[PDB]
Amino acid sequence: MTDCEFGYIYRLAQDYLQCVLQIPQPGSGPSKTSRVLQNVAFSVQKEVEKNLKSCLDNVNVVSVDTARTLFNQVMEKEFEDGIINWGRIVTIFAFEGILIKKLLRQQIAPDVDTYKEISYFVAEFIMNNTGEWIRQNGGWENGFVKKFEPK
Ligand SMILES: */C=C\C(=O)N(Cc1ccc(Cl)cc1)c1ccc(O[C@@H]2CC[C@@H](N)C2)cc1
């Protein structure tokens, strides 16, 4: 239902993970909303990775649990001043992209059925901590897309 509920947000986090992993699904392709988010979130992830080269080469992400704990430290720090904006929501997807790259390279017991887990808790955080703001600011089609679509 609607674009601020779990299903829509899970589909966005899923698409972003398939983009980072280089495994887009075959079948009509992603939505306009997803295509704009992928382009802008990836540009941010590239910057975050450069800006944290030492910090990222220190932690090891061997499991879904460890990735959730690391994502929790990030979200707490990112929103420690209490303010929500589109740039910070874009930053959530950039961090899920970095976490799935480290999990693919460091998951002690690999499992291709664990990218869906990361997407799940990312959508869980977005809906429970930013879902009200998103809907009150136009949602994804009249909020996110209008602000970040090509001019
Ligand atoms: C450098 C390790 C550290 O303290 N972490 C843990 C960490 C490392 C790698 C990933 Cl990916 C996820 C978590 C850490 C690093 C950055 C954090 O923050 C971000 C930078 C500022 C804020 N906007 C997000 C939080 C924790």
CATH number at residue 96: 1.10.437.10
Determine the longest span between alpha carbons in the chain, in angstroms: 45
Question: Is the CB of 70 inside a 6 Å radius of any atom of ligand 1?
Answer: yes
Instruction: Catalogue the long-range contacts made by 102-110 (C-beta closer than 8 Å, 24 or more residues apart).
Output: 102/56, 102/59, 102/60, 102/61, 102/67, 103/61, 103/63, 103/64, 103/67, 104/21, 106/60, 106/61, 106/62, 107/61, 107/62, 107/63, 108/62, 108/63
Count the domains in the chain: 1
Range of the domain at 138: 1-151
Q: What atom in ligand 1 is closest to the CA of residue 70?
A: 13
| Neighbouring C-beta atoms of residue 75, cutoff 10 Å | 19
Name the residue type at position 145. V
| Cβ atoms of 41 and 93 closer than 8 Å | yes
Identify the residue whose C-alpha is closest to ligand 1 atom 7. 70
Nearest protein CA to atom 23 of ligand 1, as residue: 78
* Number of neighbouring beta carbons within 10 Å of residue 88: 14
Experimental method: X-ray
**What's the length of the chain?**
151
Cβ within 8 Å of residue 81, ≥6 positions away: none
Residue 21's CB is within 10 A of a number of other CB atoms, namely 14
Say what angle helices 64-78 and 86-106 make with each other, to 10 degrees: 150
> 22 CB under 6 A from ligand 1?
no
Atom of ligand 1 nearest to the CA of 99: 11
Q: Tell me, what amino acid is at 98?
A: I
Nearest atom of ligand 1 to the alpha carbon of 54: 1
Residue 77 Cβ < 6 Å to ligand 1? yes
- Measured in angstroms, the resolution is 1.7
Q: Exposure pattern of 120-146 as b/e (b: 16+ CB <10 Å)?
A: bbbbebbbeebbebbeebebbeebbbe
